[PDB]
Write an enzyme that holds these catalytic residues in place. Structure first.
Site: not given
Lengths: 373, 373
Positions: A80, A258-260, A262
């Site tokens: 991302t 925001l890092d999905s 992680t």
């Protein structure tokens, strides 16, 4: 079927990896017996501690995208922060490359040369390659894009060779080139294949091995209630200004990414330790693993406050069950890790609650209450 | 039968107490699984640490001694630093006293008044009483001695009330009085009931719940080889000048006390940590408990060097088996505890190897290789 173009992807999460570690090292009864001890409670005494931002990544991946008119198959993972897409060249020296799918410029009628060299050098490893223009399909959407053909790959081991992944598909802003190649999703818009330079991530609550990427629109059917929007505080990061409170512990004017990809909620070390003090959470010796009773009544709602909206996580949203190890036992999906001063990241736990939107046109990011499908 | 007067006594050791703690707190599989982990070996990471000189005492006790001509029965424990003997008065206020055996001056024809008050105030507790003269028998030996009749006892809890012990029999030098009452053993000599102001401790290798006290002579039959003698470096302590080496770790001109009532070998903290570093010994989390494989080939002989003799302990002499918890597992009977600068103590482990002699006349202490009976 959806109005906009949607692709499923699979996720290898922290729970799976932890699970694998337990069978591997026969760790169940150790954990079981350590918990019993805490409960007894004979612990009382107060490099797991050392990060790593490596260990917290999940692998969100899919094998439906394809390059050129012949449709050469590749397994990508999503990332991302990166703008470019990355694939093994059929001219790939390294032995990493040998079991993977390859891009053969020659086999594609739609290929155009670029040959401009790029070089990523980082801590995990080193990628050398060249740009190359071809048709990049997903699988509704298609457009000529300039991507990177990897000629030699060094590092990212043992992960790379053990994963069935071939390369990296950029859902970010950062472009390695200096010829200002837009993100794939901006490019689809420049060439009119979608209506808006936007994507959504939907992570279904009931399936932590799955997520859905939707491109060119807001799929209304993934959420309930209004979409809130926040402005980015950085040009090239899905990142946002927010005050954060976990009970009495708080941090004003925080930087939250925001890092999905992680796997967990992160939090500065100081912050975590204040939080965890007398919260009745147990740290299992010799394991990066904090644990607690699922019905724990001391645990607060997590609060991320904007000036006109607050986003929250109940204990149920940030605690994974461990029923197969000890009854009503839960692991804490929050991890202490210090990045740049005052920087937090919202990983998979948050996106299980919030449907999330990433707007390249308007430099906004978007939150809404995920439906349950 | 022996030439000199000998009494058996029973010992409640550290192994028993640790054993009791394990059933109590159901700790076996915890220890079992923690050891497995060490062995795996995933530990690597480097108030148990806080002493206590309390926790290391064994209780060496016997119920054969008696006061007065009527022969009033008492259960004593031995204490190697105290000169006096101590018993509950029939006039004992405290509720501690109520289940114990009592001394009734009135019931004994041989009693003589003293009534001089004494008062012990210490960290564990507080004893108030008066001196009293009567016939003190063991059971071959008998002599009028001035002992302490305890009128109120405060502290030493929960130990005192849980133990079937009544009082303390002094095998030491320190007399609470100021009327220079000699030790019981000196007194037997002053009054000619023995030939020499001396006693021996024999601790049979094969029975760690037993020890034998012998008075007025060297019982040749308890040992092999020569008796060595060392001069005391203190007037009123069974204490001795010796250099000590545990491998490369060493401490010159050390103060070492002989106390068979101490359950373990002690060692300064610094010293212990140097010793234990990369010796492949495991410290069980949340327990005052170091552990190792019984066949450990890294562990050195302990050396206590005099100018004309060195006394040593092989690993077999300072490691207790734990077969009932984990196979070939052993606990380390050495404990780090800092007393006055540079002071070591030789507890039960040492006396299992060395027959030991305590000479009041000559201010010497005596070592010899214990026989196996």
């Amino acid at each position: 079927d959806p109005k906009y173009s949607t692709v499923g992807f699979n996720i290898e999460n922290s729970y799976d990896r932890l699970m694998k570690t337990i069978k591997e090292h026969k760790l169940k009864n150790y954990i079981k017996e350590s918990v019993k001890l805490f409960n007894k409670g004979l612990t009382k005494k107060s490099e797991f501690d050392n990060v790593e931002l490596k260990d917290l990544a999940n692998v969100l991946s899919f094998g439906e995208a394809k390059l050129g008119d012949n449709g050469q198959k590749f397994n990508f993972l999503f990332h991302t922060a990166s703008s470019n897409v990355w694939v093994p060249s059929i001219k790939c020296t390294s032995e990493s490359c040998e079991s993977k799918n390859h891009y053969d410029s020659s086999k594609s009628k739609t290929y155009e040369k670029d040959d401009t060299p790029v070089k990523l050098t980082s801590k995990a490893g080193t990628i050398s390659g060249i740009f190359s223009k071809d048709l990049v399909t997903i699988g509704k959407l298609s457009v000529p894009y300039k991507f990177i053909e990897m000629t030699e790959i060094v590092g990212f081991e043992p992960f790379y060779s053990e994963s069935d992944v071939d390369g990296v598909f950029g859902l970010g802003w950062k472009d390695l080139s200096i010829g200002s190649i837009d993100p794939y999703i901006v490019e689809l818009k420049t060439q009119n294949k979608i209506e808006q330079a936007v994507y959504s991530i939907y992570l279904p609550p009931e399936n932590k091995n799955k997520g859905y990427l939707t491109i060119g629109g807001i799929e209304e059917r993934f959420f309930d209630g209004p979409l809130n929007y926040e402005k980015l505080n950085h040009d090239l990061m899905w990142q946002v200004d927010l005050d954060v409170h976990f009970g009495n512990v708080s941090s004003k004017k925080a930087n939250v990414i925001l890092d999905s990809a992680t796997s967990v909620i992160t939090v500065p070390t100081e912050f975590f330790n204040q939080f965890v003090e007398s919260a009745s959470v147990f740290k299992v010796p010799f394991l990066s693993l904090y644990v607690t009773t699922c019905g724990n009544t001391k645990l607060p709602t997590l609060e991320y406050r904007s000036p006109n909206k607050v986003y929250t996580l109940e204990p149920k949203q940030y605690l994974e069950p461990l029923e197969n190890i000890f009854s009503a036992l839960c692991m804490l999906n929050i991890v202490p890790i210090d990045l740049e001063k005052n920087t937090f990241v919202l990983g998979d736990p948050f996106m299980r609650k919030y449907f999330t939107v990433y707007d390249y046109d308007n430099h906004t990011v978007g939150f809404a209450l995920a439906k349950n499908l």
